[PDB]
Structure 1
Amino acid sequence: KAKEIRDLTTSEIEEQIKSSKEELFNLRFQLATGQLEETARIRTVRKTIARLKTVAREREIEQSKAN
């Protein structure tokens, strides 16, 4: 993905962001209710969201390099 995340159509990114945020919410919710036992997913979901915002920022800058 993280290459062709840049190939996504700027609404797949938007829906992808909120799907990933619901996934992170469920993970944090079941870490507390103590049944997770694979705690490394939390970190990588965070970084995915980071990935997804970064490219969605830079489209914006290139969207105003022309205008």
Structure 2
Amino acid sequence: KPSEMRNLQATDFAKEIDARKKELMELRFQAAAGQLAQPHRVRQLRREVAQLNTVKAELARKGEQ
């Protein structure tokens, strides 16, 4: 997040996936994850690079034409 890459092409976000999506799969597990905690902070930030790879093949298509 956010919609900040509406103006930034330079492969920095290239490893942005390595951020929270690295051990939130280690919170996506069964038990000791979040039942009464803040359960929602999983696939509520898993569209973290999804629906954001749009205008990424319809904007980032900027190669040379």
Verify same fold: TM over 0.5: yes
Structure 2, unaligned runs of 5 or more: none
CA distance in 2 between counterparts of 1:23 and 1:51 reads 21
TM-score scaled by length of structure 2 = 0.60
Alignment of 1:6-25 (within 5 A): 6-25=6-25
Report the 3-state secondary structure (helix = DSSP H, G, I; strand = E; otherwise coil) of the residue aligned with 1:56: coil
TM-score (norm 1): 0.59
Unmatched segments (≥5 aa) in structure 1 = none
Provide the secondary structure at the position in 1 that maps to 2:53. Answer: helix
- Work out the CA distance in 1 between the residues paired with 2:47 and 2:22: 14
Structure number with the bigger relative contact order (C-alpha 8 A, sep ≥ 6) is 1
Identity of aligned residues (%): 30
**Bigger helix fraction:** 1
* C-alpha RMSD of matched pairs (Å): 2.3
